[PDB]
Amino acid sequence: MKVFYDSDTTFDAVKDKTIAVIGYGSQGRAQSLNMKDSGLKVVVGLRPNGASWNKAKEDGHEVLSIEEAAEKADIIHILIPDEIQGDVYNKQIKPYLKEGKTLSFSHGYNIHYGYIVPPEGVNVVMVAPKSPGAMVRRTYEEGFGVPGLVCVEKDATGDALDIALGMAKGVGLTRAGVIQTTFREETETDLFGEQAVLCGGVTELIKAGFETLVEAGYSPEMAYFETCHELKLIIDLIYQKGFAGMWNDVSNTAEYGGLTRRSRVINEQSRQEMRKILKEIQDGRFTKEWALENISGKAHLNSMRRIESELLIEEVGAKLRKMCGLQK
Amino acid sequence: MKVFYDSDTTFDAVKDKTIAVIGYGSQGRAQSLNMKDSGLKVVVGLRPNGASWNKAKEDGHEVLSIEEAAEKADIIHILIPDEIQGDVYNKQIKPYLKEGKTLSFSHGYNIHYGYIVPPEGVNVVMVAPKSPGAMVRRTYEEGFGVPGLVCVEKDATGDALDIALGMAKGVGLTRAGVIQTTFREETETDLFGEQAVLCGGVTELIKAGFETLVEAGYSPEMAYFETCHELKLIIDLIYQKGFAGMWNDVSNTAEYGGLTRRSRVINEQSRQEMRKILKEIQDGRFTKEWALENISGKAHLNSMRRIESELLIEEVGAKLRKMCGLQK
Amino acid sequence: MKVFYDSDTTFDAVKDKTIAVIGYGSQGRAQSLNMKDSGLKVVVGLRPNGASWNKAKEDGHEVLSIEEAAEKADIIHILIPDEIQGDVYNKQIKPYLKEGKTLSFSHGYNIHYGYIVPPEGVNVVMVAPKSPGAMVRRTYEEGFGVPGLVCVEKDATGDALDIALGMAKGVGLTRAGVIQTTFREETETDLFGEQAVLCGGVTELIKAGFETLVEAGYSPEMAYFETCHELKLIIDLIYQKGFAGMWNDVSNTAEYGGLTRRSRVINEQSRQEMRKILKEIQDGRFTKEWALENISGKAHLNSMRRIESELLIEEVGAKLRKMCGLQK
Amino acid sequence: MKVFYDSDTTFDAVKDKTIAVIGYGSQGRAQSLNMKDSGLKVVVGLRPNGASWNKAKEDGHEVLSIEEAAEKADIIHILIPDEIQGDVYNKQIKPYLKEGKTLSFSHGYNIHYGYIVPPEGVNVVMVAPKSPGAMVRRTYEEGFGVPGLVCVEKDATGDALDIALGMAKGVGLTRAGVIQTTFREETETDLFGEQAVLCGGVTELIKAGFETLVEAGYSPEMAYFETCHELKLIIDLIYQKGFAGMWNDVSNTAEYGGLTRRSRVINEQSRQEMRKILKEIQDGRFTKEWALENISGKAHLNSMRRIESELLIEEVGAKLRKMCGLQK
Ligand SMILES: NC(=O)c1ccc[n+]([C@@H]2O[C@H](COP(=O)([O-])OP(=O)(O)OC[C@H]3O[C@@H](n4cnc5c(N)ncnc54)[C@H](OP(=O)(O)O)[C@@H]3O)[C@@H](O)[C@H]2O)c1
Ligand SMILES: NC(=O)c1ccc[n+]([C@@H]2O[C@H](COP(=O)([O-])OP(=O)(O)OC[C@H]3O[C@@H](n4cnc5c(N)ncnc54)[C@H](OP(=O)(O)O)[C@@H]3O)[C@@H](O)[C@H]2O)c1
Ligand SMILES: NC(=O)c1ccc[n+]([C@@H]2O[C@H](COP(=O)([O-])OP(=O)(O)OC[C@H]3O[C@@H](n4cnc5c(N)ncnc54)[C@H](OP(=O)(O)O)[C@@H]3O)[C@@H](O)[C@H]2O)c1
Ligand SMILES: NC(=O)c1ccc[n+]([C@@H]2O[C@H](COP(=O)([O-])OP(=O)(O)OC[C@H]3O[C@@H](n4cnc5c(N)ncnc54)[C@H](OP(=O)(O)O)[C@@H]3O)[C@@H](O)[C@H]2O)c1
Ligand SMILES: [Mg+2]
Ligand SMILES: [Mg+2]
Ligand SMILES: [Mg+2]
Ligand SMILES: [Mg+2]
Ligand SMILES: [Mg+2]
Ligand SMILES: [Mg+2]
Ligand SMILES: [Mg+2]
Ligand SMILES: [Mg+2]
């Protein structure tokens, strides 16, 4: 296990190579803007009737058609949603793949689960930032970066690891640290994390706490500040110092209450479920569920989106974030 | 209930008829090679850019395009995977179906569940061997055959039962015995058998026994011989003599231990599940699940294939079968 | 862990030695006939008022009285049922044991559990085939052999390991592979295997599946072919290629159904019982039960034998195996 | 199903034949005394150092040694305890068995479970009274008889059914009715009956009722009369008229209370246990337990005998039966 950083990487194997960034969404716009910041030879490939095309053009980028970018570039960096990467690849990318070319991703989903089968003679690597695309850029602008994983699925030029290292440094991931792993290990840990802790866990944790107080009769305005707003100020301490830096800044009264009560909230029942969530990922049951959600038309997902927006927490949340000027 | 054999069947209604065997896979190559052995007028219809096409050509068969074989033949025997039979039929078979033609299968899945709707005026029968395709041929080469079922879903020439009987004898199924049944009864018993006993049951049974000993600290090499390898030598006894022939050859110590302990392994809980497995088949819930696995891209199935290959039993299993020369 | 084979064994330490095979039952007749095939100096010791005595005499063997064979031979190979070995040894074998002689078995039951206490100055080894006696011979006739374990409990001539190796090669076990272990490990794994998987497991598995379909209203004749007869053709694939060779020959429909349903048949409850079955063996509770079954007159065992023979599966099983000529 | 009676049986096949009654216990003395009453040619075979020998001699019988009686008689009727019949048969009966002789029992235990294996050429029948031996005689003296079963396990003279019929009529069983059945069906129903209802059931039923009242504080003397003594006067009604004759003589208050409360005493739990008790008999588990009780020395049985005699019900029971003169 070796953690690559700035002093251990170079831009040698990308010095002289054109990189097509297919996409300009969360990560797409983020990574593309950063790569260009480092003085990297980048071309963005977008839809000509799509919205992001006008957005990448205003940002000062060489917007081109996906096919045109695909035919010109040496490296093809695919930054569109996973659920539609299989179609876009087979129709607007696969044809312009010549032996010696490199196909790179930021998530091993489509490769690992077999939705994209690359042709022989082509490099398959991954450069994956472990943060939301908006953070990836903002963290780069401040002079820092976000953690990144490097992976090689197919090495044909014998040059693949260096190529991915070069791109990782450009995106800024080398500032926080870069570790080499496999597509399988990146995809499985990423899905579990987002499901059990990063997106699923915290939201339900905050929701359960907010509604415990509201249904007890306390003000919804107070409940927001105490279960949701104050959370942002706490996690910063962990990010910079871990649990010890947080326990020291917080009062001893808060330290004793949290240490004794937390085993009761995250119980053994929740620990049992986290093990099952991981097994559904490992054996492809979640992927099957997610692929069928898309083929079915996202009725379940869209309905869940609508119910989330009708939560009182989001109403009182939005009203407080606007008056103080935290949300426009 | 009448069990047809060699002395009760004839090749009369197939004497003068061309038979298209669509496919050359497990059963495809098996049944086609046997039918020709009996001096039957067979044509194989394969893909021209596919692999099996070169394989059927080397075997000394009249390889032709599916459409060409379909237009020339009187009988169309479909031996490709069920999940893709619906598309191949509607595009490369249905057009060359003329009134008086016969459409035959070896499994009632696509017919019974409605994925293939034949046109009026056409015979619909089934000739189904109750064994893996590799065994179907090897059993024929030894001078024996495997059990077969005969079924008629649509009789238009009044000749359908004789046609299926003729083909069944050619494949060699008449040596072991042929019983007439319905598509529904063939499909439901076949799926249950393979799921609850033939493929699902034994594998999990062997796995649970292997890992009981390994985790107890005994050698994985010894555990293979005692839970898996010795199983092949035991089932032969049942195949030839049933439970009594096996109980007599095995020691009294093995007879008393198995008779008293087996109710504990296959318990009432497992008996309850076998009843539910059968009801999921009977009401089309398994078929719906299997059709969606394919539309979804087989991510779950392929992931299960990968986890199976990483089992220690398969590693130590493969190493012992190679050194002794049982697997090349 | 070293796996002995043909190229790693020799007949040196048995070249010049007489071997008494006490017994002519399943293993007795099997091993004795094979040892003689290899040009080994074998004498069979049987009862003069017993049936097998006439059977070994017809086979072209030097039938002699157990005592006579015991007094003449250097090696005494005991191939009679375990439950009666203790009496036969103390009365017709122990007296003719001279220092320097070797006492060999094919199962560690009587030695490990203390029912036979050998005298000092005598070699105690084991040559154990991991297959039913009928298979041991048939496998030898085909040019192959069955797996064997080698064990040394007492080495007095410093020659014991070579002696057992010599006999193992003669029986044909060296063709499949020979591994050295202890009496304890041979006896405990053998009993567990036969109880939980080889004899107990499969029979109850097949029974539960057969009766699920029959009580659902499907034909008993069809149920036999689909839960029992087709099993023999499936295990062959595992024997030669493991789970992967079987999954590939079977259809994808059978592969998906078995992979998803098997966890439900062999459940956690069955896994818990397999752990208890192993602990009853390890602490001598099964042996105590089996010894008391014999002292009590085998009323329970014989009653279980009678109920097994009245199963409908065995009736319909026997009728189908006779008409096709698989059972005379 | 034909119920033999007095008008359907004859003493033809026993007219001219000597019958050895081995034993003079409960049934032994009972059946022997009755057979002689009918003018039957009976010899009793007892131990010469045993007690019953002096008792049969005083009763006016031809007491002889078991061997002497065995060598003289044509029919050998074995009326000793089942647990010791196997030894007495092989040592004092088997030698005097000549082809054409008949071996008869009153219980199928030793035959059915294989503790006595008769020689070929000898008749094996059963004449079984369904009542305690004391009742068998007393019922005969009153001019009535007790129900009997007739069974044939081996017919060698073609005369076996007539022989058993002849003896059944002599014992008096033909007055109540004689039904032909198998050894298996006689033994299994007899053991279940005595275990679940006739001896086990009623005693525990009476015990539970007696101690319910005593521990509630009511007089033990009153509790005896109301739960135990009055039972004898109730069953007579059922014996002569069934449930309807009893319900009519008893008060409507007793009829309504018993009809509504009885489902609560004999519940579903007891019904589940009766099914298991029958399965332990059917598969020989009870027989194995009972054979081991004897080999072990009857310590458990004798201890249960001692605890029964220390019950307060038996103390207060005995005191009331003596003062009134019902027990000497
Ligand atoms: N999102 C994260 O924070 C995050 C974190 C780590 C890794 N990743 C991975 O990074 C990759 C990029 O995901 P993302 O969330 O950033 O994507 P995204 O925002 O969901 O995708 C938006 C972009 O995709 C384009 N697009 C959508 N459908 C298209 C189609 N049919 N043809 C062509 N272009 C199409 C859009 O163009 P138009 O304007 O024309 O519609 C737009 O440029 C994924 O593999 C994801 O797993 C994401
Ligand atoms: N497998 C058994 O042991 C078994 C037992 C009883 C009954 N059955 C039944 O027998 C039938 C045959 O199954 P199977 O397992 O033997 O088939 P299979 O081996 O899975 O199918 C392989 C064959 O299908 C061809 N094929 C695949 N996709 C095709 C496509 N899109 N167009 C044209 N040809 C295509 C392949 O040709 P290429 O070389 O060109 O790819 C190859 O010849 C099924 O209905 C099954 O349920 C099977
Ligand atoms: N059976 C297997 O497949 C298997 C697999 C591995 C290991 N083993 C082990 O191999 C050993 C041999 O078992 P086995 O099953 O092959 O034996 P078996 O068939 O049950 O024994 C039959 C033989 O024992 C003789 N015999 C029975 N009672 C006798 C007595 N009182 N005195 C003398 N000879 C007597 C019989 O002679 P008569 O003809 O005179 O009656 C006959 O020759 C055991 O230790 C067993 O655990 C067996
Ligand atoms: N008991 C019933 O009500 C009843 C109901 C139906 C059927 N049966 C069946 O009828 C049969 C007779 O049973 P039972 O209860 O009447 O017998 P039992 O009273 O228990 O046996 C007593 C008799 O057995 C003799 N005896 C005991 N041990 C002996 C030995 N070692 N050698 C020779 N004689 C010996 C005694 O002779 P000594 O005086 O010398 O000791 C005495 O004559 C059994 O098969 C039973 O199952 C009984
Ligand atoms: Mg992530
Ligand atoms: Mg993600
Ligand atoms: Mg099948
Ligand atoms: Mg199938
Ligand atoms: Mg074994
Ligand atoms: Mg064994
Ligand atoms: Mg009785
Ligand atoms: Mg009784």
Author numbering:
A (entry chain A), B (entry chain A), C (entry chain A), D (entry chain A): 2 to 329
Paper text:
The ketol-acid reductoisomerase (KARI, EC 1.1.1.86) catalyses the reversible conversion of acetohydroxy acids into the corresponding hydroxyl valerates, a crucial step in the biosynthesis pathway of valine, leucine and isoleucine. KARIs are structurally composed of an N-terminal Rossmann domain and a C-terminal “knot” domain. They can be distinguished in two classes: the short class I gathering dimeric and dodecameric enzymes, and the monomeric or tetrameric longer class II KARIs. Here we describe the structure of the purified native dodecameric enzyme from M. thermolithotrophicus (referred here as MtKARI), which is the first structurally characterised KARI from a methanogen.
